[PDB]
Amino acid sequence: ANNPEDWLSLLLKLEKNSVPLSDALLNKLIGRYSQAIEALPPDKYGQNESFARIQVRFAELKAIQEPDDARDYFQMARANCKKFAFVHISFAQFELSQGNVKKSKQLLQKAVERGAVPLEMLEIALRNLNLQKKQLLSEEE
């Protein structure tokens, strides 16, 4: 039961059950994500897609709850789950949303250089960044 897949399921369910979201419910959800991260050693889960999702969701929620403090959580996810393109792109999306366009591009280029996968997701993100779109990946992409 202490595995990322079971944790991710519980966390997605909690969020589904918390709609319509309030400040109070969001704080509770963020607290539960932290509890998952306290329970899952990153060492054995560096290539685990659910663990990567847990960390990215935590960073993305912190970007809502505390955007001026959220950078380190994206750095955390990237340090722990570097193989996944979606992790780098989430970080790049955060930097872009903060107006940090050059940083967003640097992050995406470094992911490509380091062979994060799938490459096509990175190429789409770089395309949209160059077109100056607000979202590196559309909801439909």
Residue 119 and residue 91: Cα distance in Å, rounded? 16
CA neighbor of 85 nearest in space, from 49, 110, 54, 122 = 122
CA neighbor of 140 nearest in space, from 126, 129, 124 = 124
CATH superfamily of the 1-141 domain:
Tetratricopeptide repeat domain (1.25.40.10)
CA neighbor of 111 nearest in space, from 131, 83, 80 = 83
Residue 33 and residue 51: Cα distance in Å, rounded? 11
Overall resolution, Å = 1.8
Q: Which residue has the tokens 């799938």?
A: 118
Q: Where are the domains of the chain?
A: 1-141
Phi, psi angles (nearest 5°) of residue 72: -65, -25
Contact call for residues 85 and 119 (beta carbons, < 8 A): yes
Contact call for residues 26 and 65 (beta carbons, < 8 A): yes
Contact call for residues 92 and 67 (beta carbons, < 8 A): no
Its sign, for the CA torsion 124, 128, 129, 135, is: negative
What residues pair up with 84 in beta bridges, in sequence order?
A: 117
